[PDB]
Amino acid sequence: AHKSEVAHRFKDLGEENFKALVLIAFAQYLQQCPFEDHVKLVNEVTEFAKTCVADESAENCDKSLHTLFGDKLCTVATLRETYGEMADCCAKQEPERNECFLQHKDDNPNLPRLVRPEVDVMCTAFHDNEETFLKKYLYEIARRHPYFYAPELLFFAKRYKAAFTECCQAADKAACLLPKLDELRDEGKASSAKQRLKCASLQKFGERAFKAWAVARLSQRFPKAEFAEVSKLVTDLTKVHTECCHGDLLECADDRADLAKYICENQDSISSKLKECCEKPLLEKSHCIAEVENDEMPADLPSLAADFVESKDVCKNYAEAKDVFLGMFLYEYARRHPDYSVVLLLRLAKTYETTLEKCCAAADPHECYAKVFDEFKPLVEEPQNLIKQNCELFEQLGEYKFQNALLVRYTKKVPQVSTPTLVEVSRNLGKVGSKCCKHPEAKRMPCAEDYLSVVLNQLCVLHEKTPVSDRVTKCCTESLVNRRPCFSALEVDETYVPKEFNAETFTFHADICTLSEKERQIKKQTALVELVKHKPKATKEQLKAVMDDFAAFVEKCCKADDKETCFAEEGKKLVAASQAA
Ligand SMILES: O=C(O)c1ccccc1O
Ligand SMILES: O=C(O)c1ccccc1O
Ligand SMILES: O=C(O)c1ccccc1O
């Protein structure tokens, strides 16, 4: 119990780290305020922290972190006219103020995308003003992702600064930044999606779900570790992720640094893969710890049968300590199956706990729990088969064609959801195909299924804001590990009334082909989703031929003049073909 815990966080983290963390927290909490106001509040907070470090016996720096942030934050957000539904939260009292600030986070705010000015002007601005430029970048990226992982964003800002200092000073400006900027953008999107998955799992399913997930992941990653060390590590990791997902960025980063230090200080007791890159500094060290590859398998392990199935008092020990028994079973099973996906292990553990809860408090317990392992056969067979045929389809269809197939399939599964979110989710679902299908079958399943869970959680999050689909919210809320089997087993929504025909959405303009290739891809996919929504009963071949003709026509008479005639009467042929179907 350190007096003035703000001073403790300040001395543990550092001046620059504290500035970046408080700026990220302010930007995430308040996504509408201008950058200058956030800078002013950050400066006031850091000056106050400096003063209380100088004198920890101050009158009012004994205030708690949540209370201090709320009081120093909503004094400028009090403007009802300027913002609207933002000042109401702090009118109440703690801890409800922090909770209200938490639920008010907007996952998809109405914000313009990055403009990406010219390389030379950005590098000159970096040279003229470095810290302000990094602050602006952090503020923008935090606003566009309210649930991003703060220490990871610190590392990303470090890499951004390193790239600017290192390359743009050279003669070539756009030769190096653009690939680097693309790589960091992709990594940031992946990390944001993963952290949103973690936070959503935490908030919507309590302690046990995240604890089991992290136990399974760490056991898969660290086979050589004993169960006590694994339990300590998962407890600390769950504490860290709870702290970040609840807006306590300071202590979350401090705890993550402490956890990384503890892991790198006990390498022999967990894994040997950490030795190669524990030497690099704390941010990059934690970057290693986040994504260190699986440690080598120990030899001559027990076949899981002498204690979990053949035990004469298996669920006696289960009843003695339910959580401990489930943790032991999940850890042991994840030891022998590194190729198994994390969600698969969670489902198998759920099946095992259901079996023990169901059929050993009876006359013949062993007669039930002796053959529980055959129940695992379909649970592991179906996802492997699904991924196998999906990768076989992708390898022949190609990127854009797999995207088309996925959009068609998901729009047939649930057309109630709005077009843009479905387009983006299915675009990510097409991206995972190129991301993981190239891997061998040993590593094909884990990464693919994990990214599928991430994208499905993204769909659930973008759907909960405007719930319009019963089935989607139904199996986004009823279970987390069962989301992929739900969306895999969903059928065509026959009850849905086909959307009324609207020829305006098929109007064309030269901006289709005079703009970038990507925007053309999204526009064509959006038109595809709209047409599928209009006629869900249409077959794959009909849609494919129609859109091939669409692209052929668009390129054919946009590459030349006479756009007005194309639009006007080839729209008549468009509607005629739609009638002909
Ligand atoms: O580097 C980026 O462009 C980026 C974009 C979104 C989120 C985090 C990031 O680092
Ligand atoms: O650096 C860590 O402590 C860590 C470990 C596992 C997963 C995510 C993490 O940030
Ligand atoms: O249809 C699926 O659920 C699927 C399966 C494997 C890869 C990507 C996917 O969208």
CA dihedral 123, 21, 459, 387 (to 10 degrees): 80
Find the 148 Cα to ligand 1 centroid distance in Å.
Answer: 10
Measure the CA–CA gap between 434 and 419, rounded to whole angstroms: 23
User: Please, are residues 164 and 426 in contact by the beta-carbon 8 Å criterion?
Assistant: no
Measure the CA–CA gap between 373 and 309, rounded to whole angstroms: 9
In one-letter notation, the amino acid at residue 117 is P
The finding on whether 192 has its CB within 6 A of some atom of ligand 1 is yes
The finding on whether 185 has its CB within 6 A of some atom of ligand 1 is yes
Find the 525 Cα to ligand 3 centroid distance in Å.
Answer: 18
| 299, HSE (Cβ side, Cα atoms, 13 Å) | 0
Question: Which token pair is 551?
Answer: 């692209």
Q: Residue with the nearest Cα to atom 7 of ligand 2?
A: 290
Residue 10: CB atoms within 10 Å: 19
Find the 263 Cα to ligand 2 centroid distance in Å.
Answer: 10
Q: Residue with the nearest Cα to atom 1 of ligand 3?
A: 488
Burial of 490: CB neighbours in 10 Å, binned 0-12, 13-18, 19+: middle
Select from 409, 445, 413 the least CA-distant residue to 429. 409
The finding on whether 260 has its CB within 6 A of some atom of ligand 2 is yes
Find the 286 Cα to ligand 2 centroid distance in Å.
Answer: 6
Question: Which token pair is 355?
Answer: 């079996």
Select from 246, 126, 144 the least CA-distant residue to 193. 144
In one-letter notation, the amino acid at residue 522 is I
Q: Residue with the nearest Cα to atom 2 of ligand 1?
A: 185
Method: cryo-EM
User: Please, are residues 412 and 453 in contact by the beta-carbon 8 Å criterion?
Assistant: no
The finding on whether 256 has its CB within 6 A of some atom of ligand 2 is yes
Measure the CA–CA gap between 178 and 189, rounded to whole angstroms: 16
Q: At what angle do helices 249-264 and 227-245 cross, to 10 degrees?
A: 160
The finding on whether 141 has its CB within 6 A of some atom of ligand 1 is yes
Q: Which residues 6+ apart lie within 8 Å of 456 measured at CB?
A: 425, 476, 483, 484, 487
Question: In terms of C-beta distances under 8 Å and separation of at least 24 residues, what long-range contacts does 46-51 make, across chains too?
Answer: 46/15, 46/18, 46/19, 46/22, 48/6, 48/72, 49/6, 49/7, 49/10, 49/18, 50/10
Burial of 79: CB neighbours in 10 Å, binned 0-12, 13-18, 19+: exposed
Q: Which residues 6+ apart lie within 8 Å of 469 measured at CB?
A: 414, 416, 417, 463
Among the four given CATH numbers 3.90.1300.10, 3.40.640.10, 1.10.246.10, 3.30.360.10, the one describing domain 203-290: 1.10.246.10
CATH 2.40.50.140 applies to domain 503-581: no
Measure the CA–CA gap between 50 and 22, rounded to whole angstroms: 14
User: Please, are residues 501 and 547 in contact by the beta-carbon 8 Å criterion?
Assistant: no
Tell me: cis bond preceding 281? Omega within 30 of 0 counts.
no
Measure the CA–CA gap between 397 and 548, rounded to whole angstroms: 14
Q: At what angle do helices 119-128 and 174-221 cross, to 10 degrees?
A: 80
Three-state DSSP class for residue 105: coil
Backbone angles phi, psi at 189, to 5 degrees: -65, -45
Measure the CA–CA gap between 21 and 393, rounded to whole angstroms: 45
Q: Return the ∠ at Cα 16 (arms to 10 and 22), rounded to 5°.
A: 65
Q: Which CATH code fits 384-489? A: 1.10.246.10
Find the 289 Cα to ligand 2 centroid distance in Å.
Answer: 6
User: Please, are residues 126 and 167 in contact by the beta-carbon 8 Å criterion?
Assistant: no
User: Which alpha helices (H) appear in 222-337, and where do they start and end?
Assistant: 227-245, 249-264, 267-270, 282-290, 305-308, 314-320, 322-336
Measure the CA–CA gap between 184 and 64, rounded to whole angstroms: 35
12 assigned ligand-binding residue: yes
Burial of 305: CB neighbours in 10 Å, binned 0-12, 13-18, 19+: exposed
Select from 99, 199, 110 the least CA-distant residue to 152. 199
541 assigned ligand-binding residue: no
Query: Mind giving me the DSSP string for 11-64?
Result: HHH-HHHHHHHHHHHHHHH-SSS-HHHHHHHHHHHHHHHHHHHH-TT-SSTTS-
Measure the CA–CA gap between 484 and 457, rounded to whole angstroms: 10
The 3-state secondary structure of 462-508, one letter per residue: HHHCCCCCHHHHHHHHCCCCCHHHHHHHCCCCCCCCCCCCCHHHHCC
CATH 1.10.246.10 applies to domain 304-381: yes
Q: At what angle do helices 399-413 and 540-558 cross, to 10 degrees?
A: 130
Q: Residue with the nearest Cα to atom 10 of ligand 2?
A: 290
Measure the CA–CA gap between 501 and 367, rounded to whole angstroms: 60
Select from 46, 103, 50, 52 the least CA-distant residue to 69. 46
Question: Which token pair is 67?
Answer: 């209370």
The finding on whether 157 has its CB within 6 A of some atom of ligand 1 is no
Backbone angles phi, psi at 500, to 5 degrees: -65, 140
Among the four given CATH numbers 1.10.246.10, 3.40.50.2000, 2.60.40.10, 3.30.70.270, the one describing domain 5-103: 1.10.246.10
Find the 546 Cα to ligand 3 centroid distance in Å.
Answer: 24
CA distances from 514 to 19, 310, 518 (A): 43, 69, 12
In one-letter notation, the amino acid at residue 510 is A
5 assigned ligand-binding residue: yes
Select from 329, 463, 439 the least CA-distant residue to 387. 439
CATH 3.40.630.30 applies to domain 119-201: no
Question: Which token pair is 204?
Answer: 């919507």
Find the 274 Cα to ligand 2 centroid distance in Å.
Answer: 13
Please note each residue after which the chain is broken, C-to-N distance over 2.5 A, or write none: none
Q: Residue with the nearest Cα to atom 10 of ligand 1?
A: 188
The finding on whether 452 has its CB within 6 A of some atom of ligand 3 is yes
Q: What is the sign of the dihedral through the CA atoms of 265, 268, 269 and 274?
A: positive
Question: Which token pair is 332?
Answer: 């042991």
Question: Which token pair is 221?
Answer: 């990653």
Three-state DSSP class for residue 561: coil
The finding on whether 387 has its CB within 6 A of some atom of ligand 3 is yes
Measure the CA–CA gap between 397 and 214, rounded to whole angstroms: 36
Question: In terms of C-beta distances under 8 Å and separation of at least 24 residues, what long-range contacts does 429-438 make, across chains too?
Answer: 429/455, 430/399, 430/402, 430/403, 430/406, 433/390, 433/391, 433/394, 433/399, 433/402, 434/394, 434/399, 436/391, 437/390, 437/391, 437/394, 437/395
For the CA of 406, the nearest atom of ligand 3: 10
Measure the CA–CA gap between 354 and 240, rounded to whole angstroms: 30
382 assigned ligand-binding residue: no
Substitution site in 395, 403, 429 for ligand 3 pocket (most atoms within 8 Å of beta carbon): 429
The finding on whether 566 has its CB within 6 A of some atom of ligand 3 is no
CATH 1.10.246.10 residue spans of the chain = 5-103, 119-201, 203-290, 304-381, 384-489, 503-581
307 assigned ligand-binding residue: no
Measure the CA–CA gap between 184 and 120, rounded to whole angstroms: 19
Place of tokens 């060390």: 229
